[PDB]
């Protein structure tokens, strides 16, 4: 129904035709420019018989076919014009010698050129173009019309056509449509009566007074009707007192309202777009690919190092590639030469501050291998968002996690690590590593634990306890990665943003919170904080014990509904003495104030 435009010029044998064909059949509205350049004399042109509208310009240059039949072409919009001047550009459509020349331009239904002019020159055997009243078609009075220097030995125009025709036939006549209308219409009329103007949604002329009578839509087309906007995605339901998805929803693809975007198009906001913006991500909703805000930063996947890669370790030339990376396709290797520099390959030492680039990493598909770490960095808090180590690819003797000979590390600091899907674990020769002794690897390491742990020769458990380096009281029997309530494997009571807490803000505190599977989530804003009582039982405006501002149905709202469009018109409400939102009078136009008719607007 709707196809894209080509954007080339006179720039270009068999492929070119293939590209043209697949592109324009079976489309009706060209979102761009219709460019027909260098086409053979016996090429099938029936795939262009359904084109009704072209939003850009029409370029017909150096073709060899005898006739160009566009019987359904009604409107050339001219949003993009050729050489800044022409909506229609026809030039050089004839063969080197041979009788393979274009003789007829069949635009029998061409009614309107909204912007741009017409250029028809140097077509040796093209006739009848000098008889057409182009001013009847071209809306803009300032546009240039240049039709000259074409066919010289041309047949007279048929007597039925009255001197104006697209061809020599009796059905090839041009039908004049420009009429004289009254002042009330701003140049948009279908008759001379002041009550015979075109609809306000008509771009130019029209066949009648209705939505459905335009030659071209001023904004959008909805299944035959020219509309200011496509049907809204959301609609206020009077019975559920909130915005519900509209069944009649259509999205913006150019100037047409469509129920679903094409194959390679996503829905952002109200419109079909080529790709999703950097601030939003692609998600499947009700059958369609929609764009929704990432809630922070968007997922990004980077290639790793080690096994199956070009880098054996991350270094000065690699570290910059992991910016804003959440998932790592492969492994991470931290070797001695990578951290301190490689003289053989002339790679400088790594800047410790650049290691903070891994703070966005949530998952490592392969293994994690740390054999070298900066002296002043006594932990791996750089990997504090790391949740999963896949172990899909292993290191050495089947290791997925390997912390070796890091004599300055005091605690692990993997406070988000919850799963190591496969592989063995090797943590040794870290002489000052404490906290790891009490950790239950069964909860983290997936599968049978037996013989998959190789943890020894670290700081002895006796020295750690005597120095006070033990787990926080709020930690469960699972253990911890370091000191504090935010370093626990699991909490005894509740957790608030990765930090173990004794209780949520149930009865006091800002913001107020509710419990959900031993986790603290805040109440909806607009819940009035209750003194000595629970504020909410869950998230949402309908789970509040009392509304801060107003109440609409079961929900709490900041502002009473002041013109929210529903199924059959806008919906207005007012806040009564009990701050609850009540409907307005049925005969009110814009405002409310109160329930009575006298309070309107």
């Amino acid at each position, epitope marked *: 129904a709707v196809c894209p435009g080509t954007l080339n010029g006179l720039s270009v044998a068999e492929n070119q035709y293939q590209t043209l064909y697949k592109l324009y059949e079976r489309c009706e509205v060209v979102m761009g420019n219709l460019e027909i350049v*260098l086409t053979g004399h016996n090429a099938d042109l029936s795939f262009l018989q359904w084109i009704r509208e072209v939003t850009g310009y029409v370029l017909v240059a150096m073709n060899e076919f005898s006739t160009l039949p566009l019987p359904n072409l009604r409107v050339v919009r001219g949003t993009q014009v050729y050489d800044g001047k022409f909506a229609i550009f026809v*030039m050089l459509n004839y063969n*080197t010698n041979s009788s393979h020349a274009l003789r007829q331009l069949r635009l029998t239904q061409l009614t309107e050129i909204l912007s741009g002019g017409v250029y028809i020159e140097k077509n040796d055997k093209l006739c009848h173009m000098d008889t057409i009243d182009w001013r009847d078609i071209v809306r803009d009075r300032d546009a240039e019309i240049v039709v000259k220097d074409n066919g010289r030995s041309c047949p007279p125009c048929h007597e039925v056509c009255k001197g104006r025709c697209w061809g020599p036939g009796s059905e090839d006549c041009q039908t004049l449509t420009k009429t004289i209308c009254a002042p009330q219409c701003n140049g948009h009329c279908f008759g001379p009566n002041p009550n015979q103007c075109c609809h306000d949604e008509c771009a130019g002329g029209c066949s009648g007074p209705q939505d459905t009578d335009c030659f071209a839509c001023r904004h959008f087309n909805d299944s035959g009707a020219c509309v200011p906007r496509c049907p809204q995605p959301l609609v206020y339901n009077k019975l559920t007192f909130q915005l519900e998805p509209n069944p009649h929803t259509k999205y913006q693809y150019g100037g047409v309202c469509v129920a679903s975007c094409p194959h390679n198009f996503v829905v952002d906001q109200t419109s079909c777009v080529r790709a999703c913006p950097p601030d939003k991500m692609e998600v499947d909703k009700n059958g369609l690919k929609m764009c929704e805000p990432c809630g922070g930063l968007c997922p990004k996947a980077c290639e790793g190092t080690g096994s199956g890669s070009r880098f054996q370790t991350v270094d000065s030339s690699n570290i910059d590639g992991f910016v804003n990376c959440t998932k790592i396709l492969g492994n991470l290797d931290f070797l001695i030469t990578g951290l301190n520099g490689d003289p053989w390959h002339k790679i400088p030492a790594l800047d410790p501050e650049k290691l903070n680039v891994f703070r966005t990493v949530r998952e490592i598909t392969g293994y994690l291998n740390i054999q070298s770490w900066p002296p002043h960095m006594h932990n791996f808090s750089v990997f504090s968002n790391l949740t999963t180590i896949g172990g899909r690819s292993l290191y050495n003797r089947g290791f997925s996690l390997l912390i070796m000979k890091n004599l300055n590390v005091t605690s692990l600091g993997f406070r988000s690590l919850k799963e190591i899907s496969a592989g063995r674990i090797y943590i040794s020769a870290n002489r000052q590593l404490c906290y790891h002794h009490s950790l239950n690897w069964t909860k983290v390491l997936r599968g049978p634990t037996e013989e998959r742990l190789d943890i020894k020769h670290n700081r002895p458990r006796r020295d750690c306890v005597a120095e006070g380096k033990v787990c926080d009281p709020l930690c469960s029997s699972g253990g911890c990665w370091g000191p504090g309530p935010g370093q626990c494997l699991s909490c005894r009571n509740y957790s608030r943003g990765g930090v173990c807490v004794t209780h949520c803000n149930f009865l006091n505190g800002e913001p107020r919170e509710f419990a959900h599977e031993a986790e603290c989530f805040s109440c909806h804003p607009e819940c009035q904080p209750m003194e000595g009582t629970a504020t909410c039982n869950g998230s949402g405006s309908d789970t509040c014990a009392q509304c801060a501002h107003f109440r609409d149905g079961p929900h709490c709202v900041s502002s009473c509904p002041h013109g929210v469009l529903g199924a059959k018109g806008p919906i207005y409400k007012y806040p009564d003495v009990q701050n609850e939102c009540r409907p307005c009078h049925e005969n009110c136009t814009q405002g409310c104030k109160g329930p009575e008719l006298q309070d309107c607007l």
Partner: antibody
Amino acid sequence: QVQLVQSGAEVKKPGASVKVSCKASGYTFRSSYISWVRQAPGQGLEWMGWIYAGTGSPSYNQKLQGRVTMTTDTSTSTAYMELRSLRSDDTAVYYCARHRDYYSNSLTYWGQGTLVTVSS
Amino acid sequence: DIVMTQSPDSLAVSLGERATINCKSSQSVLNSGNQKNYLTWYQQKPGQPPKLLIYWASTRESGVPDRFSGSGSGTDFTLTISSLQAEDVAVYYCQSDYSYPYTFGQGTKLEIKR
């Protein structure tokens, strides 16, 4: 900059044929029209025809009665013109010129010209 | 075919004075579609190829001095030189920019009035 160098002088007997070259440089040769104009000694200018270098589509003057044929070589950026069945009157200086653009046939860049003299 | 007639055939103008050359075409050259006159003026000194001065009746080519000027419409056109210089002596040609066969005028020599 933009240059158009034509071939040397030619001397032919009545009934023979001439092929004159015109090598272009200094601009994109493909997107241009090349026109040919002749001028008899002491007489005025006369348009013979033009040709689009990109495809090779020409347009000749009917008064030459089908004796003129124009060609373009994209590889050498050279235009060629050919006159068949030569006459005494076809003794002229034959000029090779370029149209300024698509919208004007006016000849802005000319060649130095070649003298084609036809006599027995 | 269109016919271009230039008047006079030869013109003698003193140095620094003003020179006008007329051109009359058999058919109109004005295009109602854009109100543009497709008329071209050339200058040819003896021994060298012609030089383009003015196209579209009144528009000068890049490099052409301000003293050269074109006017007229439809079938009557005029080429004026406000102050004739010593390098301005040559034969001047009229040409149709409209269509086939782009006919040249018969030409007019301009000499210094001595």
